[PDB]
């Protein structure tokens, strides 16, 4: 029962007044020249427009009372909104519009050419005569009159004349030529099958002292850290190169796992560019750092008192980034070269922690593990959990090869790479040729937008016929 | 002259203008919108 939409649609978008302005608003409207489903059958963003027999309407993601449902019903001048036949909203031929959680309002009295103008925000917080309609995101240039009434508007994707009118923000285009402007998904991650030693680096019964912080490379792991927040409770996690949310979408060329045990009132010193007897004499983090830092309380295990932990306290020189120093030549703060004597102005370098179950928070041991890495370099070993699809072989795709995103047509390649050689960068330093992380083949990327349209037109006054170039 | 000026206009897509990197997809795939935007903007102000 399709029928052609003629001129109806446009609604007053926002609560701000405008008069005698050709404003352009990017919102979802009713298309011109569209299919309304006229229903007269008497013998399950969206739109709606209709002796007032239909009242309300019901939705949900599945509608089986296992998940949240939603019932909205209208009345003569009353409404009832619930989750059922956790919210109890109660208030006070012909087209009375019930326009769409975003519902609209402002009804107003097939369809002639009249150009009406339409307009409570009802919260839900959950997942979701007699005419009909629909809305999709399509630009509209509204013509506010001298009194605030929308007298004219232009669809912005309907006809070439419409695109030219949008480009010039005008209703009258003169004779000439105008230069208007003018897929699936692939994911490919390497063939790593095994996890990483989560339960070997995070719950080791003993960690090393700070001044001799341990170090461990990780390789060939698909690290799904979701399995980690079931057991421990991390008191600090601040990634410094990459936003935390995207940590399961990339691949990490090399990764290290530095581990040690500092006091509670020092965990803030593990950060690029700070001072303290941890950031000067024990473990210095480089300024151009990239990595994540993890730290949680450990008073349950590393406490007796526990004197098995040491830290370097006296030194005449600050450490450089990532500079382990182990030595026992006692410090010389004065004049004489004290040869082992912990005497005047010459003391031992290393001291201990008096970790104790009675220590106040801030004196409690805090295990710390930092994970340094480097992103989107050529060879990648450790990656994220996500799976891999198959190649599409010459169709436009939003590929996700080995971390990096990108759009284009994935044609076959003949680039004579070195067996050592992975990525081809173009003259503008934009990647164009890639090595498949699974088939070890070579693909070429051709971005496709293919611009350069023009609209040959006589004066819009003279006629409507236009020719595209 | 008209083929030398236009070649610089392409050479200058390799400069990151103080951002994290010079490839927009890199920035988009390493940072969330709250922090991605503050880098894209020092790209968009560098190419314009």
């Amino acid at each position: 029962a399709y029928t052609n939409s003629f001129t109806r649609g446009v609604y007053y978008p926002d609560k701000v007044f405008r008069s005698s302005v050709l404003h352009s608003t990017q919102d979802l409207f009713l298309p011109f020249f569209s299919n309304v489903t006229w229903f007269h059958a008497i013998h399950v963003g969206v739109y709606f427009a209709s002796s007032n027999i239909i009242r309300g309407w019901i939705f949900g993601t599945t509608l089986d009372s296992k998940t949240q449902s939603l019932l909205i019903v209208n009345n003569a001048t009353n409404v009832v909104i619930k989750v059922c036949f956790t919210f109890e909203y109660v208030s006070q031929k012909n087209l009375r519009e019930f326009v769409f959680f975003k519902i609209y309002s402002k009804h107003t009295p097939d369809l002639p050419q009249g150009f009406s103008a339409l307009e409570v925000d009802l919260p839900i917080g959950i997942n979701i005569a007699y005419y009909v309609g629909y809305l999709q995101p399509r630009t509209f240039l509204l013509k506010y009159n001298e009194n605030g009434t929308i007298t004219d508007a232009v669809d912005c994707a309907l006809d070439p004349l419409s695109e030219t009118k949008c480009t010039l923000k005008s209703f009258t285009v003169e004779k000439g030529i105008y230069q208007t402007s003018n897929t699936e998904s692939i994911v490919r991650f390497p063939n790593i099958t095994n996890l990483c030693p989560f339960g070997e680096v995070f719950n080791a019964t003993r960690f090393a002292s700070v001044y001799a912080w341990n170090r461990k490379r990780i390789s060939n792991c698909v690290a799904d850290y979701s399995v980690l927040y079931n057991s421990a409770s991390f008191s600090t996690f601040k990634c410094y190169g990459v936003s935390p949310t995207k940590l399961n979408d990339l691949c990490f060329t090399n990764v290290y796992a530095d581990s040690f045990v500092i006091r509670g009132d020092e965990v803030r010193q593990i950060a690029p560019g700070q001072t303290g007897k941890i950031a000067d004499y024990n473990y210095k983090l480089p300024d151009d750092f990239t990595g994540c830092v993890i730290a949680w309380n450990s008073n349950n295990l590393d406490s007796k008192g526990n004197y098995n932990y040491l830290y370097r306290l006296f030194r005449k020189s600050n450490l450089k980034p990532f500079e382990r120093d182990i030595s026992t030549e006692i410090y010389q703060a004065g004049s004489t070269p004290c040869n082992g004597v912990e005497g005047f102005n010459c003391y031992f370098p290393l001291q201990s922690y008096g970790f104790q179950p009675t220590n106040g928070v801030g004196y409690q041991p805090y295990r710390v593990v930092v994970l340094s890495f480097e992103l989107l370099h050529a060879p990648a070993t450790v990656c994220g959990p996500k799976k891999s699809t198959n190649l599409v072989k010459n169709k436009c795709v939003n590929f996700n090869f080995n971390g990096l995103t990108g759009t284009g047509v994935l044609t076959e390649s003949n680039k004579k790479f070195l067996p050592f050689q992975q990525f081809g960068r173009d003259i503008a330093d934009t990647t164009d040729a890639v090595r498949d992380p699974q088939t070890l083949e070579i693909l070429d990327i051709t971005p496709c937008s293919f611009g350069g349209v023009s609209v040959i037109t006589p004066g819009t006054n003279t006629s409507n016929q236009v020719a595209v170039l | 002259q008209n083929a030398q000026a236009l070649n610089t206009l392409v050479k200058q897509l390799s400069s990151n203008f103080g951002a994290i990197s010079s490839v927009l997809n890199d920035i988009l795939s390493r940072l969330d919108p709250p922090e991605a935007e503050v880098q894209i903007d020092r790209l968009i102000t560098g190419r314009l």
């Binding site: 003259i427 503008a428 051709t446 971005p447 | 236009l6 070649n7 392409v10």
Partner: peptide, 29 residues
């Protein structure tokens, strides 16, 4: 202009064309 050559280019206009003289695809992309 000469009758012999297919175009109406004269014997001096051609000496100019044959004297005045990938990346262009990249610009196109």
């Amino acid at each position: 202009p000469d009758p012999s050559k297919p175009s109406k280019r004269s014997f001096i206009e051609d000496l100019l064309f044959n004297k005045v003289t990938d990346l262009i695809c990249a610009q196109k992309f």
